[PDB]
Amino acid sequence: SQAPYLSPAVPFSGTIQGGLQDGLQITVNGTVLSSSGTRFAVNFQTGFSGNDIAFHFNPRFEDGGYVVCNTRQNGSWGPEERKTHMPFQKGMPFDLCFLVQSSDFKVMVNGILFVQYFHRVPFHRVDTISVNGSVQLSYISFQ
Ligand SMILES: OC[C@H]1O[C@@H](O[C@H]2[C@H](O)[C@@H](O)[C@@H](O)O[C@@H]2CO)[C@H](O)[C@@H](O)[C@H]1O
């Protein structure tokens, strides 16, 4: 029920005005760049530190393309999960939707379930979404 971020410049760090509460659905619509950059990441975190990211979703256009999901606590990366699926094209706007559940995040890419990720830390300590890399952001919205 929070008014969306329209065309946010991309290194971006903005507030989830009440934190992640269960049921919440968050769309990130953007478009991957053809710059030399070969990664971007959408991070759900505690604050603007970026030292503790409950859920780091990091698509990479290297090694053939693969997305890495992980969780940062006090500046130290837990074990990754990887899909080798890569749901994005350079040059095409994705509708990327994170749905918040009791046990997990369900990440839909263009309304098809891409990965589901199980919370390692609790989710209602998360107050900030940040995005960086070779992506341009049309919008981030809250539902
Ligand atoms: O796991 C998310 C972070 O990975 C970092 O690099 C990893 C690399 O992914 C992995 O293959 C292994 O070699 O350990 C590295 C530790 O730094 C990224 O640089 C970071 O941005 C996160 O994406």
Side-chain angles (χ1 to χ4, degrees), residues 2-143:
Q2 154 179 357
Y5 291 99
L6 296 193
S7 308
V10 148
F12 166 90
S13 258
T15 275
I16 319 187
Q17 77 173 42
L20 288 190
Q21 287 279 58
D22 182 35
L24 193 66
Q25 173 152 196
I26 300 157
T27 316
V28 175
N29 180 289
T31 308
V32 191
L33 289 187
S34 67
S35 89
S36 56
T38 42
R39 305 172 153 197
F40 73 93
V42 168
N43 297 307
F44 286 88
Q45 42 183 66
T46 353
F48 309 84
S49 182
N51 254 23
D52 36 35
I53 300 170
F55 179 26
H56 166 81
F57 171 84
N58 179 219
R60 309 183 174 177
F61 302 95
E62 46 225 43
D63 283 356
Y66 62 104
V67 178
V68 171
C69 303
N70 217 351
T71 282
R72 219 173 178 192
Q73 17 197 210
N74 59 114
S76 73
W77 288 116
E80 328 192 312
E81 299 170 19
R82 293 188 180 191
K83 284 268 138 175
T84 86
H85 192 138
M86 158 69 86
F88 311 112
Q89 260 167 326
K90 296 198 158 187
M92 185 107 193
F94 50 92
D95 258 293
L96 171 57
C97 174
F98 305 99
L99 205 1
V100 184
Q101 312 266 67
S102 305
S103 60
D104 61 4
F105 282 93
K106 278 196 174 184
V107 183
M108 333 275 240
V109 190
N110 306 338
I112 302 149
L113 172 84
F114 174 52
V115 234
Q116 146 233 47
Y117 183 98
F118 298 87
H119 318 278
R120 329 200 155 162
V121 316
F123 70 86
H124 60 274
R125 271 195 253 291
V126 165
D127 55 0
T128 300
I129 179 157
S130 104
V131 185
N132 57 70
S134 61
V135 70
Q136 216 193 242
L137 280 173
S138 284
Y139 82 83
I140 293 179
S141 67
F142 304 84
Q143 183 149 41

